[PDB]
């Protein structure tokens with residue numbers, strides 16, 4: 001279902017990409033998006049799918065567009081439009097200077113200082129989960145680790161019951177990788193229904209959990225409102241539940257198929273931080289966008305006020321103009337160029353958290369299970385959307401080649 005081309009769009013700029021169902025998804029999600037950076041594709045295209053919107057395809061344009069809040073507003077950041085209209089998360093549906101204060105708060109809950117505090121539980125949980133898996137010689141990495149690992153840690157942070165997981169997860173998934181089962185609005189309302197009660201409770205009877213801090217926070221000198229907190233927590237939730245989860249699977253899928261990469265990490269462990277970057281570059285997985293606030297000519301293309309543009313965070317690091325041999329994984333690249341965690345004012349707050357989770361996983365996994373692969377005759381399926389994912393990851397290994405710690 002293609003939407004009739006608006007009059008301001010030149011035909012030569014049309015490239016019908018479907019962010020929710022890219023053509024050669026079989027080849028992998030990143031490769032599927034990379035079609036956009038082939039020679040036959042202009043830097044800025046219009047797709048008729050998902051209601052019609054612009055896509056910027058080069059590191060350079062995405063970076064610029066992200067800097068330019070004046071022109072490119074976070075107000076309606078999701079495609080399609082109905083979803084972007086419904087989106088009211090804080091601080092992401094806010095432009096500076098309004099953004100600034102909410103950002104400072106969210107930072108209190110997720111910043112460096114919190115990561116630093118939780119470091120021992122992160123390490124504790126990863127070790128616990130790996131050790132538990134080790135002797136089985138087989139898991140479902142997505143369900144067995146990638147999910148519980150980050151999730152349980154967020155739940156700890158949030159002070160929410162692990163009992164809620166399955167439910168929260170269904171709803172978050174509905175937002176990034178729509179099923180068809182529920183609209184964005186519908187999904188958002190249900191998450192909101194979950195949070196309302198809890199927020200009220202923590203406004204009265206505060207604790208030390210992230211939710212308690214957000215609920216009782218100060219913004220622009222005054223007390224945050226109930227609605228505002230509901231809206232920030234909505235963000236925290238999506239962030240805790242939906243990002244690190246998918247990334248881990250992509251990384252692990254890769255590590256499963258590259259003996260030589262695993263080995264490099266085992267002998268020269270001082271390279272783990274470098275490799276984490278490179279993996280973040282190569283298995284980049286978020287794509288959102290901005291809304292034109294007014295008519296604006298950008299790189300010779302005339303954008304009209306109200307036009308939505310997708311600026312794929314995933315795409316920067318994959319652009320050959322940014323990194324030579326972009327689909328190649330090189331842990332010793334002199335310069336790892338990406339915008340996996342965004343660019344401009346909205347730069348991911350949770351990045352420190354994400355980095356710790358990844359790095360721990362890599363060291364702790366390789367220590368114990370150095371040798372593993374994908375279960376024979378497994379068809380590994382990726383999924384596209386706001387946050388791309390791996391459907392399942394069947395891994396197999398010889399218990400005898402493992403190391404108990």
Ligand code: HEM
Pocket residue numbers: 074077090091092099103106110235236239240243244247285286288289313340341342343345346347348349350351353354
């Ligand atoms: C691999 C993991 C992650 C990736 C790829 C990622 C990606 C993103 C991106 C692309 C944005 C900016 C979106 C925009 O400019 O429209 C962002 C913002 C944000 N992220 Fe993440 N994120 C990650 C992990 C997390 C985690 C675990 C948390 C929660 C602890 C989180 C919390 C946030 C928040 C609060 C913001 C909004 C900052 C603001 O609007 O100023 N992130 N993230």
Ligand SMILES: CC1(C)[C@@H]2CC[C@@]1(C)C(=O)C2
Pocket residue numbers: 089092176235238239243286287288386387
């Ligand atoms: C694009 C994002 C990664 C950022 C945090 C969660 C997310 C899905 C949004 O709605 C804003």
